[PDB]
């Protein structure tokens, strides 16, 4: 199995720096050129930097040339990206890539604002509030910054009928989203429902139970 | 750099029907060893890009036969013989013949499934949030198609505007539907001085608009 | 969006009884014949009972005829199975099905033994305990009864590289299993690893952090 | 009851290659209206059965063209033109022509992928479990193929027997490999009077048997 695992993402003040790391396994890492590709939400794939097999040839777009440095350690099967003089336009998801495979990416955001943990509120269901023939319930994950947040239902045991909406920036400059789940109306009593909310940048883990309210 | 240009950028397809994407390169992609390093990637909703076709026409591991790539020089084509629901996502053609690695703008394939009306639910703000001083009211439009829908918030039958944000999910890879949340924000004090909160949903799958609503304190 | 959600499973003493429920949504439930099908682990699909659309027509194999009763409530969109005089050979996963779709199933165990919660032990990773180029870690979920138990990693966020093994009955009559995950060697320090263990029949929920240790 | 019979019950397939399952019914399956209620179901690892083909030859919603069904009367065939990794699982033919609904014994499709050697890891018991009185030692064989493998436990070079259980996963729907846990159980006091704990793995992808081991209380 091939794995590419980025890490090091987070929030930085403008002008500040950040180092990203990528750990690879499942293929001959030394035999492969590697690259960092980034993507702002909605946008497409922008190449940030490339380095070749032995690690002796690099390329940079003018947009980051002089600022970013792609490094490599064929022994630890790792790939690095030193980001200096960070600009607000550098805000993006950064992927580690080999051509054949892409990591899941790490989130880099550049802003002059502090990190806030989310509040998590029940979107309580109801019988009498059924939409043929499902009930709906959820969790409101509000006023956090920066991205990302992780949301699961029942420690991952509940996945069918789940929708976790894309975060939206509020005029406050804080993110907010809802995660919802629909279940057949009659199954409402039969089980308990907990949303699992994780926001690493502020070290916030919440497990909110969601009940009918009566 | 070698510029990659895709056509179209939006590709609506009824499932089971074929689909074609064109990719043009600003320069020949034949490398000095005679090979052509044109590739196709697919980024499914919620996921990293994955390799679909490498070197014009080679299917990557796990890739079904319905995906076939062809072309030469500067003009290439990805064909999907029968678009399945799971094929939804954005397709990128790409060249690695010369540094830098470059990508097309990306084509977003959309499944043209049957019309489906949204299930609508309205959620009052929790008493817990009301401690904080703010009140979020949420309206859920679930598993509908097509994406275009209108949500109107009416407080005490007074149509709202300027105080609500929407969020749509990407097209579902299993049933080709969307879901939408609309979130009405207002102050606690503002919230308490009204009674009837309502959400009204217009969608092509509904004969007539649907309203869900609640009265603060019932 | 079709859903079929079974509930009511669990452990019963021989001779005792149990009621299973199935909540349906996303299709015209009244318009469909329904059945209960069971499956012992390893074994194939055994029909338990069928009911037609009305439903005023039922069938039972002789293996359960006289003991089991399949009812239907076309109003609440629900299907039921009343199981009386339960026998040890009735131990199985019971599925709710319409022919087009099957629920995830609910687990029925008929035994002369008591319910016990699991212990969860770290399977701690290390170096140079690497196997090119991955490290392995996990959780040992031991001495519980009856099935099932739920295991996830990092509240559902970590899923690739994960192997959760089929439970095995020990000679003590208690189940045991391991859940393990492999990650690229040099990504060990860069993230924390919690296994999330739930065993409903005893109300046991454990989250165990797994660390390298010295 | 109409009896359903499948051939074969074990079906090894090199991926990309085609596969065929036959299904015979003990009685004709055409119903009073002229239709034939012969269906194929698929149960992927860890999942419920799902409908693949209904009424001999109709692809269910979401089912790709590589799955085609054919046949008539009492003789039916499912063909998979190009077996993909994700196609792994157990296939059942089924009739609903007459009550009761019945099922074949099931055909388990195996993906014949290339040999893959297991990555092997050994885990000492936690200090925590050792307070309970029992010590579990665990050996992991990860992402290998084929499934046949031998695990032997050695304690102070004494070969063990009768104190270890194995668990194997189902074939992976993504990389077509298996994984295996072997778990050596013994008394705390038993565990303390020995020093060298070792796991020895033999597999077709290993030129020579591989041993991982640890010494009690070292790290």
Numbering used by the authors:
A (entry chain H), C (entry chain E): 1 to 52, 52A, 53 to 82, 82A, 82B, 82C, 83 to 95, 101 to 215
B (entry chain L): 1 to 27, 27A, 27B, 27C, 27D, 27E, 28 to 213
D (entry chain I): 1 to 27, 27A, 27B, 27C, 27D, 27E, 28 to 214
From the paper:
In vitro studies demonstrated crenezumab’s ability to block Aβ aggregation, promote Aβ disaggregation of oligomers, and protect neurons from oligomer-induced cytotoxicity. Crenezumab’s IgG4 backbone confers reduced activation of FcγRs in comparison to IgG1 and was shown to minimize FcγR-mediated inflammatory activation of microglia – which has also been proposed to contribute to neurotoxicity – while preserving FcγR-mediated microglial phagocytosis of oligomers. The complementarity determining regions (CDRs) of crenezumab feature a very short H3 loop of 3 residues and a long L1 loop of 16 residues, thereby creating a deep paratope groove at the interface between VH and Vκ.
For comparison, we also determined the crystal structure of CreneFab alone at 2.5 Å resolution. Interestingly, superposition of the CreneFab-alone and Aβ complex structures showed no major changes in the CDR structure. The root mean square deviation (RMSD) of Cα atoms for the variable domains and CDRs-only was 0.73 Å and 0.71 Å, respectively. More pronounced changes were observed in CDR residues Tyr23HC, Asn52HC and Asp101HC, which adopted alternative side chain rotamers upon Aβ binding. Another major site of interaction was around Lys16Aβ and involved CDR H1 and H3 loops. This region of the antibody underwent relatively large structural changes upon Aβ binding, where the Tyr32HC hydroxyl group shifted by ~3 Å, and Asp101HC adopted an alternative rotamer conformation.
